[PDB]
Amino acid sequence: GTIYPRNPAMYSEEARLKSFQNWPDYAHLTPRELASAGLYYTGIGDQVQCFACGGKLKNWEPGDRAWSEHRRHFPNCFFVLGR
Ligand SMILES: CN[C@@H](C)C(=O)N[C@@H]1C(=O)N(Cc2c(OC)ccc3cc(C(=O)O)ccc23)c2ccccc2OC12CCOCC2
Ligand SMILES: [Zn+2]
C-alpha cells in the first residue's frame, strides 16, 4: 500500500504492550496508555517509539499524556491521523 509502518512487528497493540516488561519504575506513564498511542519500549531509559511513524519520545514529564506528546511532536503520523 501507500503507507508503511516503521516497525511492522509492533503493528499489534499486544506486541507493543509486551515490550514494556522492563519499563523502569520511575517512568510514570502506563504501558497501557503508551501502547494504545502506538508506542513501544526501545529498551533504553524511558524512550518509546511509534510503530507507525517511527518517532521517538523520551524524558517524560509530569502531566505528559501519550497521545498528546505523540501528536505534538509527530502530527503527520498515520497512526495519529487515523485515530
Ligand atoms: C515533555 N515530554 C517529553 C516526551 C518530550 O517532549 N521529550 C522530547 C522528545 O521526546 N522529543 C521527540 C523527538 C523529536 O520530535 C520531533 C525528534 C527527534 C527525537 C530524537 C530523539 C532521540 O534521538 O532519542 C528523541 C526524541 C525526539 C523532542 C522533540 C523536540 C526537541 C527535543 C525532543 O527531545 C526530548 C526533550 C529533551 O530530552 C530528550 C527528549
Ligand atoms: Zn507515530
From Swiss-Prot:
It comes from the Eukaryota. S-Nitrosylation down-regulates its E3 ubiquitin-protein ligase activity. It is found in: Cytoplasm; Nucleus. BIR repeats lie at residues 13-80. Expressed in colonic crypts (at protein level). Ubiquitous, except peripheral blood leukocytes. Signal peptide: none annotated. Multi-functional protein which regulates not only caspases and apoptosis, but also modulates inflammatory signaling and immunity, copper homeostasis, mitogenic kinase signaling, cell proliferation, as well as cell invasion and metastasis. Acts as a direct caspase inhibitor. Directly bind to the active site pocket of CASP3 and CASP7 and obstructs substrate entry. Inactivates CASP9 by keeping it in a monomeric, inactive state. It is linked to Lymphoproliferative syndrome, X-linked, 2: A rare immunodeficiency characterized by extreme susceptibility to infection with Epstein-Barr virus (EBV). Symptoms include severe or fatal mononucleosis, acquired hypogammaglobulinemia, pancytopenia and malignant lymphoma. Monomer, and homodimer. Part of a complex composed of SEPTIN4 isoform ARTS, XIAP and BCL2, within the complex interacts with SEPTIN4 isoform ARTS and BCL2, SEPTIN4 isoform ARTS acts as a scaffold protein and stabilizes the complex. Interacts (via BIR3 domain) with DIABLO/SMAC; the interaction inhibits apoptotic suppressor activity. Interacts with HTRA2/PRSS25; the interaction inhibits apoptotic suppressor activity. Interacts with TAB1/MAP3K7IP1 and AIFM1. Interaction with DIABLO/SMAC hinders binding of TAB1/MAP3K7IP1 and AIFM1. Interacts with TCF25 and COMMD1. The first BIR domain is involved in interaction with TAB1/MAP3K7IP1 and is important for dimerization. The second BIR domain is sufficient to inhibit CASP3 and CASP7, while the third BIR is involved in CASP9 inhibition. The interactions with DIABLO/SMAC and HTRA2/PRSS25 are mediated by the second and third BIR domains. Belongs to the IAP family. This is E3 ubiquitin-protein ligase XIAP. It comes from Homo sapiens. The gene is XIAP.
